[PDB]
Design a binder for this molecule. Structure first.
Ligand SMILES: O=c1[nH]c(=O)n(COCCO)cc1Cc1ccccc1
Ligand SMILES: O=c1[nH]c(=O)n(COCCO)cc1Cc1ccccc1
Lengths: 285, 285
């Protein structure tokens, strides 16, 4: 069963999920979500809707459950729940708080949660799929520094090991699907935080930025995105078995911009869902 | 003229605003945006669209300019540009990198940018509008900690002094419109970062949370939201004249929950736009 790490929550008469337009009094959560086994999360609402429709076809069998809010979108096809999370640590963390609670109230059990996304690559070919083993912060440390009241509390960021191995095993059967298990760096800023030179702000040199990206590579970093540390930390704290599966759209050692025919970009963006469908069909098999 | 603070930017052949679905070569930015004088930013696309429709009627004269992406929404009516920014520091920072560049490329001049939002109040009545003077972090310090590569750089978080005074002076004429100029705390987490007891995670007691909020009040904090430090720091660095105007929906020293008739909620939500309309018509009057 999905647990929370909050001694007060179940002492409450009612729980309202403020950003999902759901609640324990207004909705029958167990009835609505009791059968969920696979939770897939990603930044882009359109991606996540397209993912749900894709899974619907793949499983051989769909409306936004959060149609009443504009914060996040949520789609359900069978035991698969797909949810958008917007961009950045705070945005995914709001969603995770409310989703983990939803799973808890619905009394879901034997659940797997997977983030699917895009990322920038370091020293790997554009379009390589990275299955994160450990998410690291901007200083390449395997940790999430959580601010709780006015206090920094450090949390571990390891994804589920057996799960990452299982996804990697699934990837091997897929043709023209470059895949690796490796560290993912998660940043608070897309621009200076990732050593881009095209922000409204850039206070460092080309030399510093290329030195940073190489030191990241030496430290084990293979891709870079904006949600993996909080995602891994929150799931771990609550005992949820979690994975991150991101496709890289470019190699940052060689390139700041995506230079791809639209058609190749679309294929790449679809790579994580391809792997996740394989995984899910294997589990249900 | 709106400036950037990046010596690499205008040595570039083209500049693609990836999350806005706009670029210098695919779009004529001066033609589209050159007349923009007032930039209004908020978390919710629904709210920002309704604000664009409100201002259109208020100025006595609208589609999503960013229809091609799902990351942000953007509406224009005359000299007024309304943009959504999702939730949290990273989400607004990406919008702001790309927004400020756009204003630069468009050769916009005499621009005022204003964040409008909702917030939790501390020790002030629900429905109170706070015009932020200085944005502070979770420890109550007047600084934004920027992570740039693997270094931390501290930045000032003062909003424009004259603009805040001018916004306050505008509020005086408005009946039943409680307003104050004061500190706004910006957190990276909605739940544990704001002393909530109803997260998936809760690592503190009720007693500790109350003490935290009382020390926040002692330190000058009047309201709590999630975007103000990075908004203040980035606008300041680029020499942009910026304000934050948020309505409080509850007094966190009293209750953890919003308890309001639907009609009252709607009125409180619309209070920041009411003040911004007054301000904009004054400037154009
Ligand atoms: O370099 C990246 N960094 C990154 O954090 N992501 C993840 O998504 C952040 C929002 O697009 C995605 C990428 C690939 C990319 C590169 C340039 C433009 C757009 C996307
Ligand atoms: O307490 C708050 N804290 C806060 O950071 N905000 C700002 O936006 C967060 C997204 O809802 C808004 C509020 C008001 C609130 C209170 C309870 C539920 C929802 C919103």
């Amino acid at each position: 069963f999905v647990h929370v790490k909050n001694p007060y929550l179940d002492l409450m008469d009612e729980d309202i999920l403020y950003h999902l337009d759901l609640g324990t009094k207004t909705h029958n959560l167990p009835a609505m979500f009791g059968d969920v086994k696979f939770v897939c999360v990603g930044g882009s609402p359109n991606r996540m809707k397209a993912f749900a429709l894709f899974m619907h076809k793949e499983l051989g069998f769909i409306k936004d459950i959060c149609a009443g809010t504009d914060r996040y979108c949520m789609y359900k096809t069978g035991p698969v729940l797909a949810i958008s999370h917007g961009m950045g640590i705070p945005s995914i963390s709001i969603m995770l708080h409310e989703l983990i609670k939803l799973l808890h109230h619905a009394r879901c059990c034997d659940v797997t949660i997977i983030r699917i996304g895009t990322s920038g690559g370091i020293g790997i070919a554009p379009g390589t799929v990275v299955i994160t083993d450990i998410a690291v912060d901007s200083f390449f440390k395997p940790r999430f520094e959580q601010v709780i009241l006015d206090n920094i509390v450090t949390r571990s960021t390891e994804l589920d090991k057996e799960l990452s191995e299982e996804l990697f095993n699934c990837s091997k059967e897929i043709p023209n699907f470059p895949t690796l298990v490796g560290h993912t760096m998660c940043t608070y800023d897309f621009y200076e935080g990732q050593g881009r030179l095209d922000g409204a702000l850039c206070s460092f040199s080309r030399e510093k930025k290329l030195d940073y990206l190489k030191r990241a590579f030496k430290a084990g970093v293979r891709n870079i995105e904006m949600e993996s540390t909080v995602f891994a930390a929150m799931c771990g704290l609550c005992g949820l078995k979690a994975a991150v599966v991101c496709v890289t759209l470019l190699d940052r050692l060689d390139c700041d911009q995506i230079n791809l025919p639209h058609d190749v970009l679309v294929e790449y963006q679809q790579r994580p869902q391809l792997l996740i469908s394989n995984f899910i069909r294997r589990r249900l098999g």
